[PDB]
Ligand binder design. Structure first.
Ligand code: FAD
Length: 374
């Protein structure tokens, strides 16, 4: 517009306007619709961008870790040029909620943990213990006396988390919306949680401050040409940019057809933004939707199962020049959705495994196959 001085290390201090649970009362998962006010900042983004969000660790987790280590919490510590009491350094500048094989290995080694040492250099044992046991539970289970400097030396610096933007400024203005699945789990009877998602969910009331920046994604964007059809595949929190896409196309009043593929365990508990979609379908901006409810029956159903069953109509849309978008879990979802997409291109459209491979690839270079997976 004519400048913007906010970025990762110089974030905009914004205001948390809305923090709403969007999953049902008996969902297995807690998902928050969050709206942050951008005020007169002039911060701008496009559908497909992500919002960078700084967080602080739970003060109660910090107190727990420090007392396990025989520390007081005060104790001056130096972090990137600044002398801080232990407690403030841990709350604001160190990751506490992501364990790693190296941390596990250095703690074990540092404290000479009789119970952790057999894992040392044992490779995948280390990675498995770290995926399984948070750092505070690692020292709960094998506590030891540490000095404040030895601790902070073990730890990795705190970094912001990315959330796909769930709004379009064409519709919203002054605001950015995000779709936050909050990471909650227990460890041998203790409640644990992800750092940033529980910070947003639990530790900022309303209109309280959040430190925010835009991570642009120019490789995840609506077609120019409002007449072009778009197919959106976004189970779970992967739905978020597709809420941004529909706000945009509804706002621009794009006549182009829209197809959404969504999946999650339970219709009843986990149909994120479902009134919004039903309205889109009724106002005719959303042309089609296919739902995959994992745990709604005996057999597990996923989006990729709907993509195959919807094969011939999908193919019809591709040849009409559709753009295809995938967002959500990369670890398993993105791969199985890609193979369903190769199966469909072969099945309908003049098969040959190798040629379908080639086709999916020309699509990506043409910008007609785009993904944002994590
Ligand atoms: C481009 C981009 C888009 C994203 N968009 C979204 C979005 O729209 N919405 C969204 O929700 N997320 C999205 N994220 C992911 C988000 O960035 C975070 O990674 C996610 O919120 C978790 O952050 P956290 O800080 O809450 O947790 P962290 O503290 O980083 O949590 C780490 C996790 O907590 C623990 N873990 C999980 N469960 C268990 C268990 N049972 N046992 C022990 N260990 C466990 C840690 O091991 C595990 O690795 C996006 C990621 C990227 C890169």
């Amino acid at each position: 517009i004519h400048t913007s001085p906010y970025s990762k290390d110089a974030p905009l201090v914004a205001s948390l306007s809305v923090n709403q649970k969007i999953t049902g009362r008996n969902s297995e998962k807690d998902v928050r619709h969050i709206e942050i006010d951008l005020g007169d900042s002039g911060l701008r983004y496009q559908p497909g961008d992500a919002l960078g969000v700084w967080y602080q660790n739970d003060p109660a987790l910090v107190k727990e870790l420090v007392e396990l280590l025989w520390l007081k919490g005060d104790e001056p510590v130096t972090v990137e040029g600044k002398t801080l009491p232990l407690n403030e350094a841990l709350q604001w500048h160190f990751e506490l909620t992501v364990n790693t094989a190296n941390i596990v290995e250095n703690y074990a080694t540092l404290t000479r943990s009789e119970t952790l040492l057999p894992l040392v250099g044992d490779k995948a044992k280390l990675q498995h213990y770290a995926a399984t046991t948070p750092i505070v539970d690692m020292v709960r289970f094998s506590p030891a006396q540490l000095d404040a400097e030895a601790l902070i030396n073990l730890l990795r610096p705190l970094t912001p988390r990315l959330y796909s933007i769930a709004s379009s400024q064409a519709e919203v203005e002054n605001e950015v919306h995000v779709t936050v699945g909050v990471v909650r789990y227990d460890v041998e009877g203790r409640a644990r949680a992800g750092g940033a998602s529980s910070f947003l969910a639990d530790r900022v009331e309303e209109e309280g401050e959040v430190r925010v920046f835009i991570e642009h994604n120019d490789n995840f964007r609506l077609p120019a040409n409002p007449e072009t059809p778009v197919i959106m595949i976004g189970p779970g929190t992967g739905i978020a940019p597709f809420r941004a896409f529909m706000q945009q196309r509804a706002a621009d009043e794009a006549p182009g057809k829209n197809w959404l593929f969504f999946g999650n365990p339970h219709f009843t508990e986990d149909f994120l933004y479902q009134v919004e979609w039903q309205r889109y379908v009724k106002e005719g901006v959303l042309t089609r939707i296919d739902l995959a409810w994992s745990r709604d029956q005996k057999e597990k159903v996923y989006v990729q199962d709907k993509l195959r069953e919807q094969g011939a109509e999908l193919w019809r849309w591709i040849n009409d020049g559709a753009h295809i978008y995938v967002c959500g879990d990369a670890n398993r979802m993105a791969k199985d959705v890609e193979q369903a997409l190769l199966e469909v291109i072969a099945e309908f459209g003049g098969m040959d495994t190798e040629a379908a491979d080639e086709f999916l690839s020309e699509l990506r270079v043409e910008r007609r196959y785009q993904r944002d997976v994590y």
